[PDB]
Design a protein around this ligand. Structure first.
Ligand SMILES: [Cl-]
Ligand SMILES: [Cl-]
Lengths: 223, 166
């Protein structure tokens, strides 16, 4: 997260840390008591997931849980076209009890509105190139489909939308992949990809356009 | 595919943030360098040079907001610091080498390389058009130099050493 600040502790209780030998490599978003949504590019054959976290040390976070998952489903059109359809659903080996620090979030059914200010949270790199010790929060604004396709064609696809690129240089960065973009109370996007380096004026990041997938997500969760 | 690329200490190779030596597993005496090819006056081709080890360090970059690299990712590979796009690898037809690894000053959003497990280490594979079929990067001996170039089925195998000696 570039140019953001510590989230208020546990203010993003749907946030999931995917960790590999105790290091975070992606986030995810709890969308049901037994399912975390993440970027398809974060796929692994199995997961250790951290829920209820703020710092990444579970032993220092009352209410947190470190849970195992083996099953995940990438969207069947992931990466056709390249980078597109970037979402997958991870099935937790058991459902979690929701509380005030571990809770799922509803997915937006309407598509993003150009111009709207939204929030992104994650534990990826800061402006100075280091990893933060606690979850970072930043606002970024949805860019219009016209600007997004202009900057990213031929790789712009409507399974994506752009946000950020402002003079304020607020953006996602490496390690933020898979985590949430929240608009107007709902999960609108997942951090996906951008052109390096992060936090360039006039270059927005790209997020999975979840309003396109609500049916697949529901069907997958129910099957 | 879903395999994470690791360095010689077993840690995930980072996405762009760190530099690494590509160390040949059967030619540990040699290292990557730039040399002249055809009639050019500036050295723009990448060779395995017996005089330099561990050679020029590289960075592996993906547009994905993840800080690890998987073998299935399309990657740019580049010499130099992250802030520079002057040592970006591309594969360019050049006689009589063939499809030679060369350095350029422009980067696409998605590069055309993958790093894929091979033998005891990894080979570099070039995907013309970023399609499904990849061509192994191996060595072409010409004019007293060993040029990195396509040699499908005959990859130069490397291990990846984080460049903390600098
Ligand atoms: Cl070594
Ligand atoms: Cl010529």
């Amino acid at each position: 997260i570039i140019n953001g600040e510590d989230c208020s502790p546990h203010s993003q209780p749907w946030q999931a840390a995917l960790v590999m030998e105790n290091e975070l490599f992606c986030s995810g978003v709890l969308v049901h008591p037994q399912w975390v949504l993440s970027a398809a590019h974060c796929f692994q054959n199995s997961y250790t997931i951290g829920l209820g976290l703020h710092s990444l040390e579970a032993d220092q976070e009352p209410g947190s849980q470190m849970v195992e998952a083996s099953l995940s489903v990438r969207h069947p059109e992931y990466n056709r076209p390249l980078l597109a359809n970037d979402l997958m659903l991870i099935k937790l080996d058991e459902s979690v009890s929701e509380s005030d620090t571990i809770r799922s979030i509803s997915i937006a059914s309407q598509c993003p509105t150009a111009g709207n200010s939204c929030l992104v949270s994650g534990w990826g790199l800061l402006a100075n190139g280091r990893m933060p010790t606690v979850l970072q929060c930043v606002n970024v604004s949805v860019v219009s489909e016209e600007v997004c396709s202009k900057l990213y064609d031929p790789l712009y696809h409507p399974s994506m939308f752009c946000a950020g690129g402002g003079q304020d240089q607020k953006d996602s960065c490496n390690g933020d992949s898979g985590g949430p973009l929240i608009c107007n109370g709902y999960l609108q996007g997942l951090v996906s990809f951008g052109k390096a380096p992060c936090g360039q004026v006039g270059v927005p990041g790209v997020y999975t356009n979840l309003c396109k997938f609500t049916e697949w997500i529901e069907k997958t969760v129910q099957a | 595919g879903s395999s994470v690329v690791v360095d010689t200490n077993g840690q995930p190779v980072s996405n762009g943030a760190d530099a690494y030596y590509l160390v040949p597993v059967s030619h540990g005496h040699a290292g990557l360098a730039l040399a002249k090819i055809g009639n050019e006056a500036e050295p723009r081709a990448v060779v395995l040079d017996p005089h330099h080890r561990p050679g020029l360090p590289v960075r592996f970059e993906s547009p994905l907001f993840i800080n690890i690299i998987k073998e299935s990712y399309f990657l740019n590979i580049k010499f130099g610091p992250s802030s520079s796009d002057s040592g970006v690898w591309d594969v360019i037809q050049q006689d009589p080498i063939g499809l030679a690894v060369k350095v350029t000053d422009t980067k696409s959003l998605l590069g055309p390389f993958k790093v894929e497990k091979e033998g005891e280490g990894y080979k570099i594979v070039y995907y013309p058009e970023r399609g499904q079929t990849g061509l192994d990067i191996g060595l072409v001996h010409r004019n007293d130099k060993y040029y990195l170039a396509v040699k499908d089925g005959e990859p130069c195998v490397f291990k990846i050493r984080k460049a903390t000696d600098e």
